């Protein structure tokens, strides 16, 4: 048992979880960033 | 809220960032304006929501 802190000191899974929401939430803030070919991008 | 030319909406306050001695105002990332310098005082001041 004391040989597994040596094999962390793995979690991929983990962090995976991490990035595939943070990505998502980069996007969808970055997307408000288009004209989607209008005369602009902002309604004021 | 306006600084000459730039247009928006939020609380204003001390900042503790250093621009260049040329830049007027920064960004966060995914690029949203998040601190000015005043003009007048040319003071960095932050923009919260």
Same mark, same amino acid.
């Given at each position: 048992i004391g040989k597994?802190?040596?094999? $962390?000191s793995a979690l991929g899974? $983990?962090?995976?979880?991490?990035?595939?929401?943070?990505?998502? $939430?980069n996007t969808l803030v970055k997307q408000l960033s288009?004209?989607?070919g209008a005369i602009s991008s902002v309604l004021n | 809220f306006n600084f000459n030319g730039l247009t928006?909406?939020?609380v204003l306050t001390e900042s503790n960032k250093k621009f $260049?001695?040329?830049?007027?105002?920064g960004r966060d990332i995914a690029?949203?304006?998040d601190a000015v310098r005043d003009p007048q005082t040319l003071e960095i001041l932050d923009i919260t929501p």
């Open positions: 597994i802190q040596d094999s $962390l899974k $983990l962090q995976d979880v991490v990035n595939h929401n943070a990505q998502a $939430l288009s004209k989607f | 928006g909406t939020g $260049l001695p040329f830049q007027q105002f690029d949203t304006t």
